Design a protein around this motif. Structure first.
Motif: not given
Ligand SMILES: [Zn+2]
Ligand SMILES: [Zn+2]
Lengths: 550, 170, 126, 340
Positions: C62, C65-67, C85, C96-97, C99-102, C106, C116-117
């Motif tokens: 899966d 993120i959205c599983y 992992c 989109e994860w 990107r929003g991460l500070l 790029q 993420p994990y």
């Protein structure tokens, strides 16, 4: 034929010195006030236009004095022109004012002034000059690119806002919430204009990380209006997030559902299923919190009108749409059902979920037998670590139609020693907060009535008076709709139908109640694929004729 | 200068991740479930909710209304609306596995008692949760809905012939 | 605990239905007196795999993120460069994860940022 | 087939002279005639305007007429542009006559009567005058509203919608000339350049080059015009930002080698002063040190194929002027050290 100016002539000055307030709305607050006061003023314009069109111009002076200033204010105010037919009514208004042959030069001045404001609205760059002259040189007109132009303008911003949404704590440009709030007011007047939908979609989706709301709910509810009126045709995820962030919209839309089942379309369940599935209400309801909201609303509705049949019918339609919307799009990680139904145990729910169409017609007896057994274990042995009490399990039991209605029709088919299970069950249905003293009373009442009606069906198609005799309350609606089950089911009916019916036809309230019952049962049969065409056409003709009596 | 870190940025990785998950629109709700599934699968099954609630409750300052006015907020209201609501929704479902001591203070916040321009959602949600705890009947007009809603509901419940069903036991 | 639970299934539609109706028809046969397994085997009318493959139960594929699987046709192809992992991820979800991460930065088209994990360096090439 | 020709030419005569302020003779009969002609013509737009030889023949008549009148001298009349422009033929003239104040009494009154008898004919299948005009002014007010109440001027001009709009206007406007081959696109570009605001023109073209095609021959014709025309290129490189020109060059590598020489000219015609640690311009209108440094820094932040062009154009330009390794001597070493 009474007022002839004053209900209109007062509001004339009201709206007049309100234009002086707003005056092109180059602010926040002029804009906000104008937004709420638009449509009322529009109806004012309708009455005004009627008052003008009926008569001539250039002869009367009724409110002609300040009219030019009034209309000029309205015109230069562009949010006026953004609402649906306001502009067009202004057109027709000015058309009422024109004089073919201006005779005094004031008439010519009027007409020239009119042409001027018209060109100001229609053939006027209210815009940058460089891009204007560019196309003037290219040999274009405003018209031939304004649409795609507009479109590009929209699209740039739509992307931009997605960027801003994605920037979840980045160092980059945090787009001006002031511009966002500006757009929130800019969209709504021209919400109907087709070139805008993606922007609005993006506004509702690109939520961002504020802890406080930054849009004005005037926008939320002006959107809600066009959604529930089906003038907008949006996707689903948009409207769910709208419902999920602005509560009065949800409330006001759930209200708008009741408006139909009470006002217009009493007991036409296909209109109701149509409306439910038209909106994304069951889809949205897949979200828990929204489900709990609407449950509370229906619970309040249910405890005002202590058992309104139409409302219960609506519930079961909604529950069905919700169950299928849940089974569709929740494959991995769907919520445990005591999320939506916490107060009850989950075991009973797990049974209730099963469709009748899954199972053959015979075992539905055994189904309802175990069900009523479990309801007894619940409410009679009302121990802690369960529902609070009777009402709650009863409300649970409402939502699953078919399993609710099949008791009578099965009991008609099992009047050979009708088992106490179904008796207690239907007694619990028609009566909560009874106590076993009341339930045993009604048990033997209806069982004696079964001793009557069994032999009455075994006999020929007897009168309607041998039936009305066993009537003569705490068990009137119970026994009534029980008899109505008996009528269509027993082939001895179809002859003494109108007899029994006109007898029990005291009022229009009971008429509407039974009409709902009948639409319900037909709806049930057609959905289940379980029919006797005798009873189908019979109940059809009856309900049809009674839709004339009301 | 016109950047901030995450208000969660200082925390246990699982919980901070969970917040970053609930951030994500409606569906973030179910993503919450997926997180817990993944972590009961992961090496650290024990997810200390007790830890989490403390950080939710803990106060920190902001300067809002005018430019010249301080106030305090817990984590729970300063974080973004969507995460709040998604979080509340998850909490309803995991309510069995939560401690009352922290939950109660969280609900004192949830009331938003004396919050002009309050969060209708959070209010209703806290009400409902307290009800699910068997302690939130409140002996009030304890409607998650508005009295406005209940008013215009009764306004049309009047336009139907009630049934004789004894629901109240007066 | 001996009571009926709330239960359902996941997998293939055609395999799902028949057991659904077995349950629909044998549900009234619930006996909260013997083992719940004893109730289950004879309500769904089956016996079960006792660790049919204890080893390869499900190396889940899966999003994380959205599983989800099959995101607009896309497979969660993008993985972690980590033994601990190994988690697959979708292109757009992981974008989109991060990107929003500070913490992210790029390049021309390629981006780097924390899984993420496990919070280890992970690279995404659009 | 040919029935369309005489129907159209008379119509376009009547169209162009609509605006003309000789309007005294006119009457509602002429009005109805023009209007029903336009209704027939938009009917034709609907009927079989789609792909066919008649479509192409009429488009040939259009461009033939438009390059016959030229758009200069006797008239730079906008006129109905093309096939899609026909779709609202009546509307354009209705707008013309509003502003034609030779518009008299009776034909005007009858005109507005035709347009707006009320909602008395509210039930009509065709989206008619009133609906179209309503949506028009709707969109117009919407446009201005956005322009003043949320619009922002994008730093990335290509992303900016106005420049993006004009860009596709012009690409539309040149695909047609490339299909026509009546005159060359160069004759058109020249006349354009001279007649219109060249400052805006350069930026429009800048954004024009970078639109991905939709049917990229217009992009090619541009560079074929512009590598030939350097005086435009002179003010071009002068007026614009850095990264714009950078990505423009990476898009059209034909522009790389010329553009190095442009700056390199300006790069050599400066003089160090040891009053202030800077190269400086002899002439007023010479590119400043930092003005040029910005451009070269953008070029440093470019793709590798375009990176090493300038990177070696610098070393060669240095060594020919003496391969020094310290400030005060080589503008180019001042650069190459500043770039690290
Ligand atoms: Zn994904
Ligand atoms: Zn990892």
């Amino acid at each position: 034929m009474a007022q002839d100016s004053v209900d209109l002539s007062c509001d004339y000055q009201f709206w007049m010195q309100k234009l002086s307030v707003w005056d092109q709305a180059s602010t926040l607050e002029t804009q906000q006030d104008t937004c709420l006061h638009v449509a009322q003023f529009q109806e004012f314009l309708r009455k005004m236009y009627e008052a003008l069109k009926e008569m001539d111009s250039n002869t009367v002076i009724e409110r002609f004095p300040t009219i030019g200033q009034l209309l000029a204010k309205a015109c230069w105010n562009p949010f006026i022109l953004a609402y649906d037919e306001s502009q067009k009514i202004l057109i027709w208004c000015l058309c009422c004012l024109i004089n073919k042959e201006p005779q005094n030069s004031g008439q010519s001045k009027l007409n020239s002034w009119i042409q001027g404001v018209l060109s100001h609205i229609l053939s006027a760059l209210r815009f940058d000059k460089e891009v204007a002259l560019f196309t003037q040189g290219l040999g274009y007109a405003p018209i031939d690119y304004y649409p795609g132009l507009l479109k590009n303008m929209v699209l740039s911003l739509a992307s931009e806002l997605r960027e801003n949404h994605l920037n979840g704590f980045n160092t980059q440009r945090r787009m001006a919430p002031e511009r966002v709030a500006s757009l929130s007011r800019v969209c709504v007047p021209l919400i109907t204009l087709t070139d805008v939908d993606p922007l609005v979609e993006a506004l509702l989706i690109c939520h961002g990380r504020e802890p406080q709301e930054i849009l004005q709910p005037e926008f939320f509810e002006a959107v809600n209006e066009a959604i529930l009126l089906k003038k907008i045709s949006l996707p689903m995820s948009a409207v769910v997030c709208l419902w999920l962030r602005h509560l009065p919209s949800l409330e006001k839309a759930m209200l708008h559902l009741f408006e139909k089942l009470i006002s217009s379309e009493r007991n036409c369940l296909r209109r109701i299923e149509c409306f439910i599935k038209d909106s994304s209400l069951p889809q949205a309801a897949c979200h828990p919190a929204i489900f709990r909201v609407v449950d509370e609303m229906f619970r309040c509705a249910l405890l005002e009108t202590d058992g309104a049949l139409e409302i219960i019918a609506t519930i079961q339609v909604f529950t069905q749409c919700f169950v299928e919307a849940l089974e569709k799009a929740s494959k991995q990680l769907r919520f445990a059902l005591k999320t939506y139904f916490p107060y009850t145990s989950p075991s009973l729910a797990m049974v209730l979920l099963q469709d009748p169409q899954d199972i053959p017609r015979g075992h539905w007896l055994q189904t309802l037998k175990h069900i009523s057994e479990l309801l007894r274990e619940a409410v009679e042995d009302q121990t802690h670590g369960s529902c609070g009490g009777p009402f709650e399990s009863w409300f649970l039991f409402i939502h699953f139609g078919g399993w609710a209605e099949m008791v009578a029709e099965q009991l008609l088919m099992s009047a050979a020693e009708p088992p106490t299970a179904l008796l207690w069950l239907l007694a619990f249905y028609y009566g909560p907060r009874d106590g076993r003293q009341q339930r045993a009373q009604t048990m033997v009442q209806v069982k004696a009535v079964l001793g009557h009606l069994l032999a009455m069906s075994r006999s020929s198609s007897l009168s309607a008076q041998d039936l009305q005799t066993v009537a003569g309350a705490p068990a009137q609606q119970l026994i009534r709709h029980l008899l109505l089950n008996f009528l269509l089911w027993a082939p001895g009916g179809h002859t003494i139908a109108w007899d029994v019916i006109t007898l029990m036809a005291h009022t229009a309230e009971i008429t509407h109640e039974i009409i709902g019952f009948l639409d319900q049962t037909l709806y049930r049969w057609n959905r289940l694929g379980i029919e006797s065409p005798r009873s189908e056409k019979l109940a059809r003709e009856l309900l049809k004729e009674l839709r004339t009596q009301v | 200068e016109g950047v901030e870190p995450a208000p969660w940025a200082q925390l246990e990785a699982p919980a901070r991740l969970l917040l970053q998950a609930l951030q994500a629109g409606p569906e973030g709700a179910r993503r919450g479930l997926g997180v817990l599934r993944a972590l009961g699968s992961r090496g650290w099954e024990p997810f200390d909710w007790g830890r989490l609630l403390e950080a939710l409750c803990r106060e920190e300052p902001v300067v809002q209304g005018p430019d010249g006015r301080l106030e305090l907020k817990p984590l729970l209201l300063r974080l973004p609306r969507i995460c709040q609501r998604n979080l509340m929704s998850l909490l309803m479902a995991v309510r069995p596995s939560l401690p009352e001591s922290g939950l109660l203070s969280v609900l004192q916040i949830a009331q938003q008692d004396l919050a002009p321009d309050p969060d209708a959602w959070l209010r209703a949600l806290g009400e409902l949760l307290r009800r699910d705890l068997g302690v939130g009947t409140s002996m009030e007009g304890a409607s998650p809905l508005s009295e406005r809603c209940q008013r215009q509901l009764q306004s049309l419940c009047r336009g139907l012939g009630l049934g004789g069903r004894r629901l109240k036991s007066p | 605990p001996t009571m009926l639970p709330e239960c359902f299934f996941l997998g293939a539609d055609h395999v799902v239905k028949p057991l659904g109706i077995k349950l629909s028809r044998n549900i009234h046969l619930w006996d909260p007196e013997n083992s719940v397994l004893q109730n289950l085997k004879d309500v769904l009318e089956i016996d079960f795999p006792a660790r049919a493959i204890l080893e390869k139960s499900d190396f889940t594929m899966d999003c994380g993120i959205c599983y989800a699987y099959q995101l607009d046709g896309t497979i969660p192809d993008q993985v972690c460069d980590n033994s601990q992992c190994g988690q697959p991820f979708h292109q757009i979800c992981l974008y989109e994860w991060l990107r929003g991460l500070l913490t992210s930065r790029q390049s021309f088209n390629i981006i780097f940022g924390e899984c993420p994990y496990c919070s280890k360096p992970i690279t995404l090439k659009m | 087939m040919e029935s369309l020709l005489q129907h159209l030419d008379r119509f376009s005569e009547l169209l162009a002279v609509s605006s003309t302020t000789y309007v005294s003779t006119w009457d509602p009969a002429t009005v109805r005639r023009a209007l029903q002609w336009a209704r027939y013509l938009r009917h034709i737009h609907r009927r079989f305007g789609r792909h066919g030889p008649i479509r192409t023949a009429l488009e040939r008549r259009l461009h033939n007429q438009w390059r016959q009148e030229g758009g200069f001298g006797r008239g730079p009349v906008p006129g109905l542009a093309n096939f899609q422009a026909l779709g609202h033929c009546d509307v354009l003239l209705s707008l013309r006559l509003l502003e034609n104040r030779a518009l008299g009494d009776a034909a005007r009154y009858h005109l507005v009567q035709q347009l707006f008898p009320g909602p008395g004919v509210r039930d009509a299948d065709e989206e008619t005058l009133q609906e179209s005009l309503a949506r028009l002014a709707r969109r117009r007010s919407a446009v201005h509203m956005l322009r003043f109440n949320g619009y922002r001027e994008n730093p990335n001009l290509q992303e900016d919608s106005l420049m993006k709009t004009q860009a596709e206007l012009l690409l539309e406007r040149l695909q047609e000339v490339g299909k026509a081959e009546a005159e060359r696109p160069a004759r058109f570009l020249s006349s354009l350049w001279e007649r219109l605001p060249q400052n805006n023109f350069l930026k429009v073209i800048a954004v024009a080059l970078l639109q991905p095609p939709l049917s990229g021959e217009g992009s090619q014709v541009l560079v074929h015009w512009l590598l030939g025309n350097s005086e435009v290129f002179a003010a071009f490189c002068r007026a614009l930002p850095a990264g714009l020109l950078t990505l423009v060059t990476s898009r059209h590598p034909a522009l790389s080698p010329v553009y190095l020489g442009l700056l390199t000219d300006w790069g050599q015609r400066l003089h160090y002063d040891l009053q202030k640690g800077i190269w400086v311009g002899t002439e007023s209108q010479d590119v400043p040190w930092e003005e040029l440094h910005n451009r070269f820094q953008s070029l440093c932040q470019a793709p590798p194929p375009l990176k090493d062009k300038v990177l070696t154009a610098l070393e060669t330009c240095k060594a020919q002027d003496g391969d020094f390794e310290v400030p005060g001597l080589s503008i180019w070493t001042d650069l190459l050290l500043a770039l690290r």
